[PDB]
Design a protein around this ligand. Structure first.
Ligand code: NAG
Ligand code: NAG
Ligand code: NAG
Ligand code: NAG
Ligand code: NAG
Ligand code: NAG
Ligand code: NAG
Ligand code: NAG
Lengths: 99, 279, 76, 363, 49, 49
C-alpha cells in the first residue's frame, strides 16, 4: 500500500510543474493570452503531462506482474498445503508438514 | 540641535545561542496539517546572536545591515522607540525612519540630516511626567518620498518589574524594492535567557521603498548626561538564505519547523518530508 | 491531434483492474460449497477458538483476522 | 458485459465576477502627457496602485505609434487584476527602439537600460518629432556610451565617472583613453525617420503576490451557494460550488491549498466572508448489457454519484444503478457490477441486479 | 491472438496523426515546401512517431 | 554479464548525439550563442538525454 500510494502522490504533484511554460494553471494562460499564440504555451504542458501519465501506467504494468506471481504462488500453497499434505521440503512451513 | 553623549559603560558585545527562534509565515496563503518545504531568508538555527544592554550603561552602536535583520528586545517600559535605516545617514540617500511615537508609528522614507550620535531625548524628570523637550534625532528633511502613519496605538512605557514579561521580536527584510516587517510580542516570565521554545511571527506590514539599505541603528528615549531608564536588553541576528520544512496545524498556526542543512539527521528529515525517521 | 494514447492508457488500466479481480477469485474460490462447522467442538482436545469465525461480532472475522485487520486524504 | 464510456460532468449555471471595491481612475494620462521626459540613463520611474484602470482608451487611440505586449494580449487587459504596475518613461533615437524588447544587444540595451527574460509588461513608443525636436539643439538628452560591464535588469546607473579605456590609470576629467561616458544625441526638425526622437514608455506589472490592487470593470453580482457556477473573485477563474466555511483564516489569509496544489477555500473582495470551492459533481458512466444478439434494453451505472444528485433507481455502494430491479433472490454472477452486486437478464424478461451467492450451503 | 492483433492496428493507425504538423504524409510536407524550413514539420513527426 | 555491460555502453554513447541541437557539448552551445536564445538548444538536449 505504501509503494502504491507513493505513486499517485508523485503523479498529482506533477500538476505543479510548468515544463517550460509561463504558468502551470491551465485556466491562467487561457485567460491571459490570445487564441493563436496560446497553443505555443498550452502544447508544452501536454507533452509534459502526457509523459507524466505514461510513466505511471508503465510502472503499474510491471508492478501488477509482480503481484500476479504472488497470487499464483498463493493459489498453489492454498492447494497443496491446505487441501492436502505436502512433501515438498520447505514449501509448507519449515520442517515436516502436518496441515 | 544635537548633543553628543558618552554616559556609557564601555563594554564589548555578548554572544548567545539563538536556539529555535525566528520563523515567519513566508506566503500569505492558508494551509492545514501539511508539511510544506520552502526556501527563503531565515535566521539559521542555533546561531551566535549578538547581545547589547540598555539601562550607568548606554549601548548604541551602528551595525551593518545585510539580508535583513532579526532584532529582539526584552524590554520593561520599552524604552526603545525607533530605528533608522540607510547607507550614509547624512542627508545623501533616502533614509528610512520608523520613530514609534507613544501615539502611533510614523514612517519617513525621506533624505534626513541626522546627528552624529542621535538619541531621543524624552525628559530624567522623575516627577511622574517625562515631557519630551529634545527632538535629538535629525536636523533637516528637505525631501520626503513616503509618509505613512499607522493606527494610533498607545503602548505601555513604565515599570521596574524583576521578571520582564515584555519580549518583542521583529524581523526586517528588504527585497524586490519592498520593505517587509514581521513582528510578534510575548509575555515571558524569564529574566535574561532568550526563551527556549518555538513560536511564530505574525506579519506586520510590507511597503514600497526602493532604497539601498546597508546600515542601521536603533533609537531609544531618555537629560543627556544623566537619566533614569527602565531595564532593557536587545539581540541582533543576521539572516541568511536557507531551506526549511514546516508543520502547519489544523488551526493554521506554524507549530514546528525543521532545518535542511544543520546536520545529517536534519537532511534526512528534510528529504523524507517527515518528522520521524525510522531505523 | 496526438491520436489514440488515451484509449491505450485506459485499456491498460482496465486490464489491470480485471486481472486483480481474477486474482482474488482464483486464490479464494477453491471450494464450491460453503461448509459450516457443527455447533459441537469435540475436536479431540484442540482449542480452535481463535481461528473459527467469531459469532458475537459485526462480521464473521475471527480473533486473528480482526487483529490483523487492526494492524494495517482520498478526496484530493 | 459491462463497458465503460463517456465520462460525464455537471454543467455551470451562471457567472460571478465580484471585483474589489470601486475607486478612482488611474493617472496614466498624467504619465504619458508629462511635460518633460528624462533620458535613458536616468529613466523616470513611477508606481501605479490602488486605482481603477482602463486600457481600452489606452489602446484604441491612434495617439500611439507602436504597441507590443509581451506577456498578455491587448484585447483583454480589461479582465485581469494585478499586484502592482510600474511605468518607466524616457526618450530614445528611433533606430534603437527595437532594442527595448528583451534579450537583445545594443547601446541602449547593454550599458544603460535592460529588461529581463521573464518580462510581462507592454512597450508603447510614440513619435514626438513635432515637440521634442528643436532647431537650436535639444541636446539635454544624454545617453551612456561605455560601461565597465553590462548592468542587470532595471539597474539604473547615474554615475558620470570618467571611463578608462587603456592601461594608463584614468586621471583628471580627461586623458588618453579617458572618456566622458555620456553623449548627447541629435534631434532637429530637419531629421528623418530613424534619427527622430521617440517617447518610449514601458508598463510592467506583476501578479498575485498581494491582494489584487488594479482592475477594470466591476459588475459585482452575488455570492450564491451550492450552485455549480463560474467565478472571478480577483482574477482567479474556475468552476464549482460555494458555501460558508468554518476554516480559521487569520487576518491575512485566503487562497487555501490544504493538501497538494488546489485553489481551495478563499475569501472575496468587497466583503470578508471565508467562502469555499469544491468542484461540481462528476464521475464515469458505465453501460451494462446482454449481448446484442439477445435484446436492446440496457442499464446504466453512474459511478461514485449519489442517486439523489444524478439529475428504477437502486443505489449500491458502487454508484447509482438505474434500469434494473433489485430481487431479494441470490443467483450466480453473470455481469459483475461490483461491491458484491451482480446483474443478469431473466424472465416478462428484464435486467435484474442482485446480491452474489458464493455457491450453496452444505453442512 | 486478439490481443496481439489489437496492437498493430493502433500502431499502423498512428501513421495518420498530425502531431501538430500540417499533414500526415512526409511527401505532403516535402512536395509543398523547400528543405531548409520544412525540417520543423518533419521534426514534429519523428518525435511523435 | 555481457547483456548488462551492453546497456551501459549504449547509454554513454548517447552523450555524443545532437538530438537536433547544434552540438553535443554542453560547454559549447554557451560559448557560441547569446544567453537569451541559446536556451532553446539546451532544452532539446535535456528532452533528449
Ligand atoms: C559562537 O562563538 C564562539 C566563540 O567565538 C564559538 O566558539 C562557537 O563555535 C560559535 N558558535 C557558532 C554557532 O558559530
Ligand atoms: C511625537 O513625538 C515627538 C517627539 O517626542 C513630539 O515632538 C511630537 O509632538 C509627538 N507627536 C504626537 C502626535 O504626539
Ligand atoms: C483548532 O482546531 C480544532 C479542531 O477544529 C479546534 O477544536 C480548536 O478549538 C481550534 N483552535 C483554535 C483556537 O482555532
Ligand atoms: C463597497 O464599500 C461600501 C462601503 O463599505 C459597501 O457598502 C459596498 O457594499 C462595497 N461594495 C460595493 C458597493 O462595491
Ligand atoms: C493627453 O491629453 C489629452 C487631452 O486631455 C487626451 O485626449 C489624451 O488622451 C492624453 N494622452 C494620454 C493618454 O496621456
Ligand atoms: C444522497 O443524498 C441524500 C440527501 O439528499 C442523503 O440523505 C443520502 O444519504 C445520500 N446518499 C448516500 C450518502 O448514500
Ligand atoms: C427485498 O429488497 C427490497 C429492496 O431492498 C426491500 O425493500 C424488501 O423489503 C426486501 N424484501 C425482503 C423479503 O427482504
Ligand atoms: C531636497 O529636495 C531638493 C529638490 O530640488 C533637492 O535639491 C535637495 O538636494 C534635497 N535634499 C536632500 C537632502 O535630499
Amino acid at each position: 500500500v505504501n509503494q502504491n500510494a507513493q505513486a499517485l502522490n508523485t503523479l498529482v504533484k506533477q500538476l505543479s510543474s510548468n515544463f517550460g511554460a509561463i504558468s502551470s494553471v491551465l485556466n491562467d494562460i487561457l485567460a491571459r493570452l490570445d487564441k493563436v499564440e496560446a497553443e505555443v504555451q498550452i502544447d508544452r504542458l501536454i507533452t509534459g503531462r502526457l509523459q507524466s501519465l505514461q510513466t505511471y501506467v508503465t510502472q503499474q504494468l510491471i508492478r501488477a506482474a509482480e503481484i500476479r506471481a504472488s497470487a499464483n504462488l498463493a493459489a498453489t500453497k492454498m492447494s497443496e498445503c491446505v487441501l492436502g499434505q505436502s512433501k515438498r521440503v520447505d514449501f509448507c512451513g519449515k520442517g515436516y508438514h502436518l496441515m | 540641535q544635537c548633543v553628543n553623549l558618552t554616559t556609557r559603560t564601555q563594554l564589548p558585545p555578548a554572544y548567545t545561542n539563538s536556539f529555535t527562534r525566528g520563523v515567519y509565515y513566508p506566503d500569505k496563503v492558508f494551509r492545514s496539517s501539511v508539511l510544506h518545504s520552502t526556501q527563503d531568508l531565515f535566521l539559521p538555527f542555533f546561531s551566535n546572536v549578538t547581545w547589547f544592554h540598555a539601562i550607568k550603561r548606554f549601548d548604541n552602536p551602528v551595525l551593518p545591515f545585510n539580508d535583513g535583520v532579526y532584532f529582539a528586545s526584552t524590554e520593561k517600559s520599552n524604552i526603545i522607540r525607533g530605528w533608522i535605516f540607510g547607507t550614509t545617514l547624512d542627508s545623501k540617500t533616502q533614509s528610512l525612519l520608523i520613530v514609534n511615537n507613544a501615539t502611533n508609528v510614523v514612517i519617513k522614507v525621506c533624505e534626513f540630516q541626522f546627528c552624529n550620535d542621535p538619541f531621543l531625548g524624552v525628559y530624567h524628570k522623575n516627577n511622574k511626567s517625562w515631557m519630551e523637550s529634545e527632538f535629538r534625532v535629525y536636523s533637516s528633511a528637505n525631501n520626503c518620498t513616503f509618509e505613512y502613519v499607522s493606527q494610533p496605538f498607545l503602548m505601555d512605557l513604565e515599570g521596574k518589574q524583576g521578571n520582564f514579561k515584555n519580549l518583542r521580536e521583529f524581523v526586517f527584510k528588504n527585497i524586490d524594492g519592498y520593505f517587509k516587517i514581521y513582528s510578534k510580542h510575548t509575555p515571558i516570565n524569564l529574566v535574561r535567557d532568550l526563551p527556549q521554545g518555538f513560536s511564530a511571527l505574525e506579519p506586520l506590514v510590507d511597503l514600497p521603498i526602493g532604497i539601498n539599505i546597508t546600515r542601521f541603528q536603533t533609537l531609544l528615549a531618555l537629560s543627556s548626561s544623566g537619566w533614569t531608564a527602565g531595564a532593557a536588553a536587545y539581540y541582533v541576528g543576521y539572516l541568511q538564505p536557507r531551506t526549511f520544512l514546516l508543520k502547519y496545524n489544523e488551526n493554521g498556526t506554524i507549530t514546528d519547523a525543521v532545518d535542511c542543512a544543520l546536520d545529517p539527521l536534519s537532511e534526512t528529515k528534510c528529504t523524507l518530508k517527515s518528522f520521524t525517521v525510522e531505523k | 491531434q496526438y491520436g489514440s494514447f488515451c484509449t491505450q492508457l485506459n485499456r491498460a488500466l482496465t486490464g489491470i483492474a480485471v486481472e486483480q479481480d481474477k486474482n482474488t477469485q482464483e486464490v479464494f474460490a477453491q471450494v464450491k460449497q460453503i461448509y459450516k462447522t457443527p455447533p459441537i467442538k469435540d475436536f479431540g482436545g484442540f482449542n480452535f477458538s481463535q481461528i473459527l469465525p467469531d459469532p458475537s461480532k459485526p462480521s464473521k472475522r475471527s480473533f486473528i483476522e480482526d487483529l490483523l485487520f487492526n494492524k494495517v486524504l482520498i478526496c484530493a | 458485459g459491462i463497458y465503460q464510456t463517456s465520462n460525464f460532468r455537471v454543467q455551470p449555471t451562471e457567472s460571478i465576477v465580484r471585483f474589489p471595491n470601486i475607486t478612482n481612475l488611474c493617472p496614466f494620462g498624467e504619465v504619458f502627457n508629462a511635460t518633460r521626459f528624462a533620458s535613458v540613463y536616468a529613466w523616470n520611474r513611477k508606481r501605479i496602485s490602488n486605482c481603477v484602470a482602463d486600457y481600452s482608451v489606452l489602446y484604441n487611440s491612434a495617439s500611439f505609434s507602436t504597441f507590443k505586449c509581451y506577456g498578455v494580449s491587448p484585447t483583454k487587459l480589461n479582465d485581469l487584476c494585478f499586484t502592482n504596475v510600474y511605468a518607466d518613461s524616457f526618450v530614445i533615437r528611433g533606430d534603437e527602439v527595437r532594442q527595448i524588447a528583451p534579450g537583445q544587444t545594443g547601446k541602449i540595451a547593454d550599458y544603460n537600460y535592460k529588461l529581463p527574460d521573464d518580462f510581462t509588461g507592454c512597450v508603447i513608443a510614440w513619435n514626438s518629432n513635432n515637440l521634442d525636436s528643436k532647431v537650436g539643439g535639444n541636446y539635454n538628452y544624454l545617453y551612456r556610451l561605455f560601461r565597465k560591464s553590462n548592468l542587470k535588469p532595471f539597474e539604473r546607473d547615474i554615475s558620470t565617472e570618467i571611463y578608462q579605456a587603456g592601461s594608463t590609470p584614468c586621471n583628471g576629467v580627461e586623458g588618453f583613453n579617458c572618456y566622458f561616458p555620456l553623449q548627447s544625441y541629435g534631434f532637429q526638425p530637419t531629421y528623418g525617420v530613424g534619427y527622430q526622437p521617440y517617447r518610449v514608455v514601458v508598463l510592467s506589472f506583476e501578479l498575485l503576490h498581494a491582494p489584487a490592487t488594479v482592475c477594470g470593470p466591476k459588475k459585482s453580482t452575488n455570492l450564491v451557494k451550492n450552485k455549480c457556477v463560474n467565478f472571478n473573485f480577483n482574477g482567479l477563474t474556475g468552476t464549482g460550488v460555494l458555501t460558508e466555511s468554518n476554516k480559521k483564516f487569520l487576518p491575512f489569509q485566503q487562497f487555501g491549498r490544504d493538501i497538494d496544489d488546489t485553489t481551495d477555500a478563499v475569501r472575496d473582495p468587497q466583503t470578508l466572508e471565508i467562502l469555499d470551492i469544491t468542484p461540481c459533481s462528476f464521475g464515469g458512466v458505465s453501460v451494462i448489457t446482454p449481448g446484442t444478439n439477445t435484446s436492446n434494453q440496457v442499464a446504466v451505472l453512474y459511478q461514485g454519484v449519489n442517486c439523489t444528485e444524478v439529475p428504477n433507481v437502486f443505489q449500491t455502494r458502487a454508484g447509482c444503478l438505474i434500469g434494473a430491479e433489485h430481487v431479494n433472490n441470490s443467483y450466480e454472477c453473470d455481469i459483475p457490477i461490483g461491491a458484491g452486486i451482480c446483474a443478469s437478464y431473466q424472465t416478462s424478461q428484464s435486467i435484474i441486479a442482485y446480491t452474489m451467492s458464493l455457491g450453496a450451503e452444505n453442512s
